[PDB]
Design a binder for these strands. Structure first.
Lengths: 50, 174, 46, 150, 129
RNA sequence: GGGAUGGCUUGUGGCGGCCAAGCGUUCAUAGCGACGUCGCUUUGAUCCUUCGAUGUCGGCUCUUCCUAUCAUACC
RNA sequence: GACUAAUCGAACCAUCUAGUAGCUGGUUACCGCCGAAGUUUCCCUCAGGAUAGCAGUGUCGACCUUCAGUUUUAUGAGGUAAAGCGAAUGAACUUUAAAUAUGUAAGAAGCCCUUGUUACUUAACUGAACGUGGGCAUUCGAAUGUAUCGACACUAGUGGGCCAUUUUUGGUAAGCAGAACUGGCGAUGCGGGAUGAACCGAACGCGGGGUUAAGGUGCCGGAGUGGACGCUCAUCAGACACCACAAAAGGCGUUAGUACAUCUUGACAGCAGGACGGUGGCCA
RNA sequence: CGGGACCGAGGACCGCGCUCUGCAAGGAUGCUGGCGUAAUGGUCACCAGCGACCCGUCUUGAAACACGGACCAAGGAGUCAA
């Protein structure tokens, strides 16, 4: 993994495979997630999921 | 290319001070789901109108269902496909009961006969042939013939693959 | 032009790196002309 | 596997003395109890300095104690977790109450002749269990030949 | 423009002279001036090698140097933050002084009465004819 | 003490010019270009012009294989 | 350069002597906790050196201060695409504005104002520096993360190695040769690629259950002779191909298309017939 | 609302609670059978399915090459002083 996606995953607290986090949508977070798209799957969770 | 649905996707450029009411662009997209439909929509407007996803928005996504899914229809599809030579026009005909079924059969047909993937195929027009005289291809003209009837010679009987051995030799006459 | 910190610190104030090659050329020219004048003086004595 | 770019760090400070002095062991037990059961930071600092080594406990002279006794500190109890030494350059020793690990014989005699009191750290624990009205002093740490040659 | 020691400048090799000059790393870089000459200036630039930063010093001619606006936004925001906080204390109302990232767009309704959508094909038929 | 190029190769030259189906181009009419072609490299003569081992091969006995066939077989 | 007791380009014996080697070989129980590296910068090179960087034990200091191979905001480089020119003007046109990564800055340790001096500088008490005093805590002035602090001491190996993606510079008949970043390996086991330094998945205490990745489900072999529509018959098909052979290559193989053209005013193929006269045109 | 598999850590009470005479609420109890011994368990030898290169040294980046090893016992190499 390249150092910038490694650092972004470290800041998103995704250090292990099948770890999941809740993220509030801003530009500052959306750009990070767009960079680490080759390692993560993300989407919009509903009330049942939460 | 899978269980597809036809989507009406309407999008626009984000309003600005200079342009408070931007124009709306509608397309018909054959896609497995709404994410792929919107992605293909933004791809085509990037190719046509120079409108980007970051500077635009989706106004509407709707599903276009077939009006008469229980009626057999003839469909003419005008398409362009990209090969190592370049882009080629093709016109083809499919006898189906819905536009989505015609497009699925088209995708399987181009995959089988020309090895063309989904990304290299542009669907330019799908129309229903209003008259029988509008049918051009012989393989649909033989199917729309008057008093059509045929037998089914050499039918392999349905035998379970878990039944390894049989006591009688099967027949291929029914 | 990249300059090394040690040579920049040892460089006198007011002088720049852009005249170092001219300084070296002037020194070499001065040495060559001194040798030429010595040869001319010896030839004049002969 | 888990991606841990950072590293969990083991402690870099003493948790127990390396000395096998049984009296120091008893003092460490006492101040462990005091620092656990009291809110005074004084007891924690005293226990942690009881853990320390001799190069980390430089001696404190009576001249240094008399220097720090000035400006309203004349009545505070001086606490030094180190050896208290004598300074013969100081001709007049003021009256003082000092608690220390150990005193030299001349320093103890001069304090008792000047009229002060010398205490051990367990006597300090008895009289000031929370370190009230105390002046905590350290000697010069860098005043060593090795530190000069560093 | 007379540059002084300590300010922040931008390096831009202007013109067609950058066709064959050998040291193109510092083009577009921003650094701090440490030395001033009539036609030259000394710029401190930092490079990154793996986990650390290293310092390089370069001599750039004045025509390839412009003053940078790196601290303009910071000094400005300090000024109107002070002024807005002063008027907040004046009229006794809170004011939101922190800059925030862009939020997602809220819900809205777009009318199509005079703006009927235009149906598009993957290529334009005007191009096909 | 340390060491001991490879799905390569085969039958048709190089340089220079021209032509050229086609590829491109048609806000520039350039550029690539097979097939070819044209220039250089004694009336069956002369025998009075052999143009440099750093690189090493052989022979015997004997077995097998390939075909890119000299003979035998057929066309 | 023969012989001088099987010893001779300098015999044999003992001693100095356990001579010296940078070269070769070897170098002895277990478990636990950490754990690496290949021009960074300088020196005349090879028979060269230090040195940066990376590590471990101890400690100490309020383990205080927070920082960060990340995004955002402002502003650079790249104005480069693009839209328009019913805006002006004409990649070099611009109101506006790309993707990719990238530099700088984002607070109380800060921001100014005022006071004077100046040995700087300026026409200049003018800017700036130096100090002086004052005002700003009404929110300390983006996001996200934060068992990630700092300074000493002592100790150790490695410090011009291999492969690969991308960027860039040169090339060859063809191979290729340099740099920069990053990743892997040298130090590393496991699942799959039949097999294996460089491939894919995934990193490792001892066990039980559940679920997957890459890859597979005709048998060897665990899992489908699974489903839908087609294509292909190879005189050693094809099934992990992309490079070369190799070309605008050759096919009376097979299918799907595009363009042009003919067609009941009879198209394509055939069969029955005509295929004439000047004229045995001129020269030879 | 069924059907199945694996597991039962802890050891007076304390707590959160609930459907509140009590409980499925901070970790398994109740009932029953056969046997009470090689029956369970263990060691050794062997067959069977799957897995599995011969160690040490050297070299460089790594392999390969190369070197040592017929077998066993005892001896055998970072010590002492300043």
């Amino acid at each position: 993994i390249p150092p910038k996606p490694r650092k972004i995953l470290q800041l998103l607290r995704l250090r292990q495979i099948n770890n999941g986090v809740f993220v509030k949508v801003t530009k500052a977070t959306a750009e990070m997630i767009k960079i680490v798209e080759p390692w993560v799957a993300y989407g919009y969770p509903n009330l049942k999921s939460v | 290319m899978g269980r597809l649905q036809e989507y009406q996707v309407i999008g626009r450029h984000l309003p600005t001070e200079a342009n408070p009411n931007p124009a709306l662009y509608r397309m018909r997209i054959f896609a497995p789901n709404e994410v792929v439909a919107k992605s293909r929509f933004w791809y085509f407007l990037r190719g046509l109108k120079k409108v980007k996803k970051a500077t635009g928005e989706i106004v509407s996504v709707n599903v276009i269902s077939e009006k008469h899914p229980l009626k057999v229809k003839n469909f003419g599809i005008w398409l362009r496909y990209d090969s190592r030579s370049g882009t080629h026009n093709m016109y083809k005909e499919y006898r189906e009961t819905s536009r989505v079924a015609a497009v699925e059969a088209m995708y399987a047909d181009m995959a089988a006969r020309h090895r063309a993937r989904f990304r290299s195929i542009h669907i330019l027009k799908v129309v229903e042939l209003e008259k029988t005289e509008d049918v051009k291809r012989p393989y649909i003209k033989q199917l729309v013939a008057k008093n059509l009837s045929f037998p089914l010679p050499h039918r392999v009987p349905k035998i379970s693959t878990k039944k390894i051995f049989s006591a009688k030799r099967p027949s291929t006459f029914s | 032009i990249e300059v090394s910190a040690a040579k920049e610190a040892m460089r006198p104030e007011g002088t720049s790196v852009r005249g170092d090659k001219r300084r070296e050329i002037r020194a070499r020219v001065k040495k060559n002309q001194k040798q030429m004048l010595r040869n001319q003086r010896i030839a004049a004595e002969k | 596997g888990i991606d841990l770019r950072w590293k969990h760090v083991r402690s870099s400070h003493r948790k127990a003395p390396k000395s096998d002095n049984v009296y120091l062991k008893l003092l460490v037990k006492l101040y462990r109890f005091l620092a656990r059961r009291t809110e005074a930071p004084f007891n924690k600092v005293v226990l942690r300095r009881l853990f320390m080594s001799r190069i980390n406990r430089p001696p404190v002279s009576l001249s240094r104690i008399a220097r720090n006794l000035k400006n309203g500190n004349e009545k505070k109890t001086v606490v030094v977790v180190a050896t208290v030494t004598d300074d013969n350059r100081l001709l007049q020793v003021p009256k003082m109450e000092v608690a220390a690990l150990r005193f030299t014989a001349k320093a103890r005699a001069r304090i008792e002749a000047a009229g002060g009191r010398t205490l051990t750290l367990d006597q300090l624990a008895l009289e000031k269990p929370t370190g009230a009205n105390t002046l905590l002093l350290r000697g010069p740490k860098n005043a060593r030949e090795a530190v000069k040659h560093f | 423009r007379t540059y002084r020691v300590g300010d922040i400048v931008d390096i831009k090799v202007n013109g067609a002279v950058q066709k064959g000059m050998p040291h193109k790393f510092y083009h577009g870089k921003t650094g701090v001036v440490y030395n001033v000459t009539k036609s030259a200036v000394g710029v401190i630039v930092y490079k990154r090698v793996k986990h650390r930063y290293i310092e390089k010093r370069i001599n750039v001619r004045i025509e390839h140097v412009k003053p940078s606006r790196s601290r303009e936004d910071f000094l400005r925001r300090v000024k109107e933050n002070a002024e807005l906080k002063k008027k907040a204390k004046a009229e006794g109302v809170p004011v939101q002084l922190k800059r925030q990232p862009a939020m997602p767009r809220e819900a809205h309704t777009v009318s199509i009465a005079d703006n009927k959508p235009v149906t598009l094909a993957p290529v334009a038929y005007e191009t096909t004819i």
